[PDB]
Every structure is written in C-alpha cells, then in structure tokens.
C-alpha cells in the first residue's frame, strides 16, 4: 500500500513546527535571531533525538543558547525523511518567491 511520504509527514509535527531534522533552512527566518547563524549550525548538526538536544551543539555562545531556549517551543523532531534531506534540499529546496 503506497504512501506519499511528504504528505504523510505533513500530518506529523513537521506540518506544525520547524522540524530540526527535516525542515528546509529558510524556515528559520520566521523567528527572531535564528537565521542564518544558528540555522546553519542546526541543519549541520542534525539529526537530533530530542528538541532540547539542539542546545548541545558545540561552540555555541550563551546568547545563542538562550535564543535557542526561547524558540524551543517552535521546534520539533520527527524521523529523518530521506526525501527531504537528500540532494542538499535542506539548504535549497528549489523554492524561492
């Protein structure tokens, strides 16, 4: 029984929040302070077992940790979907304006 996996993923938390494991990087422009620096570190250090695990990225400043903490309510994680992360699509998903 065949499933469209992106559509399926949209019914998970991926469709409601920024999925640190899957969401394209431009999504971090939605909230203050995440783009491009933290966004780059987050995508680079994925996947994550839990949202809070993002705080363990090496090299972070205290300011950065605090921003991450203020925006955790906006993050989620789901299983890595190959279709969303191959091809470097997390950095450029073929979508502009």
């Amino acid at each position: 029984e065949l499933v469209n996996v992106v559509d399926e993923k949209l019914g998970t938390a991926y469709g409601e929040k920024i999925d640190l494991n899957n969401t394209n990087i431009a999504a971090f422009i939605q909230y203050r302070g995440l783009y491009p620096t933290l966004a780059k570190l987050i995508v680079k250090n994925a996947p994550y077992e839990s949202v809070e695990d993002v705080l363990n990225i090496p090299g972070l400043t205290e300011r950065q940790k605090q921003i991450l903490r203020e925006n955790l309510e906006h993050f989620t994680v789901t299983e890595v979907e190959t279709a969303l992360v191959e091809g470097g699509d997390r950095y450029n998903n073929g979508l502009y304006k």
């Binding site: 399926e8 949209l10 019914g11 409601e16 998903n93 979508l95």
Partner: protein, 168 residues
C-alpha cells in the same frame, strides 16, 4: 441550490442529517455532477458519456468535509473552463482552510496539517467517516466534480476523460 433547499426543508422538519440526505433522489444528485456538464467534452473524444467517466452505478452520498476543529469545509468546484483544477477547501465564508498543495515544502494547508476529515450522508456510503488523508483527498478530488458517483469503468473500457452529451 435545489438539493440544498430540499435538505434544509428536511432538517427543518426534524430529520437527522443522514435521513435528510438519504431522501435526496439519486437522479437529482446525478444532475449535480460536472460529468453531465455538456461543456466538458472534446472534439475527438468520441462516443457516449459512458465511455468516459463510466456507467454510473450509484451515488456515493454527499461528501462533507471537516477539519480537526470540526468546522465544515467546502471544496471549490471546477468551472467548466478548466480541464484540470486544484483542490481547495474553504469555510462557509470562503476563507481557505485546506488544500492539496503542489509544492509541499511551505505548505500550511495540507489535509494532514489541518486534519481534514470526510463523512458521507445518503447514498452507498451513508453514515461512514474517513480520516486517513489519502482517502479524504481522493474524495475531495472527486468533490471538485460535485456529487460523487460509483462507476463501472470496466464494461466499456472507459478511459476516464469526460465526453460531451447529445446536446453538445
């Protein structure tokens, strides 16, 4: 409009939703289906309407769409002009609540996100509710055509493409 008038008159007299819709004659629902619109054909699409969408077997009943909050959603109907048409659902005031997205990466209205559901009243599917996004989408795809019917596509090797009527 006439179908809705009859259904409203049915609800007003105390009928349940299911009863109200089951009282709708199948013939009338069949007139409210774009496959019977004579402006949907093709010059070289030869033969009877049946060779296209198939021999109509039965009305499935009226498809009612709802989101996770339980607000009733309405599929935007395909105008005759369009050989193909997107799938768009709005609330009663025409505000967009759900769709079938083309690009997914920035989708905000997927049926999956909005938890769109469908329940059927009247016809073969009376009383049934489907919540799995693939099936609800399928019925939405059919709902752009209006009332949804079961077809025999096997008997005539129907090809699935609308043909015009003797009127056309």
């Amino acid at each position: 409009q006439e179908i809705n008038r009859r259904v409203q008159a049915s609800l007003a007299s105390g009928a349940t939703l299911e009863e109200a819709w089951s009282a709708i004659p199948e013939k009338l629902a069949f007139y409210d289906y774009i496959g019977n619109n004579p402006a949907k054909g093709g010059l070289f699409r030869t033969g009877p309407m049946n060779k296209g969408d198939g021999i109509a077997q039965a009305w499935k009943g009226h498809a009612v769409f709802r989101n996770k909050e339980g607000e009733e959603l309405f599929v935007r109907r395909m105008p005759a002009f369009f050989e193909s048409f997107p799938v768009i659902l709005t609330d009663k005031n025409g505000v967009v609540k759900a769709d079938i997205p083309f690009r997914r990466a920035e989708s905000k209205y997927s049926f999956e996100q909005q938890g769109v559901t469908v329940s059927f009243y009247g016809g073969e599917l009376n009383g049934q509710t489907f919540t799995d996004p693939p099936t609800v989408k399928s019925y939405a795809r059919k709902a752009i055509f209006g009332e949804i019917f079961e077809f025999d596509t096997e008997t005539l090797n129907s090809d699935g493409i609308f043909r015009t009527s003797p009127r056309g």
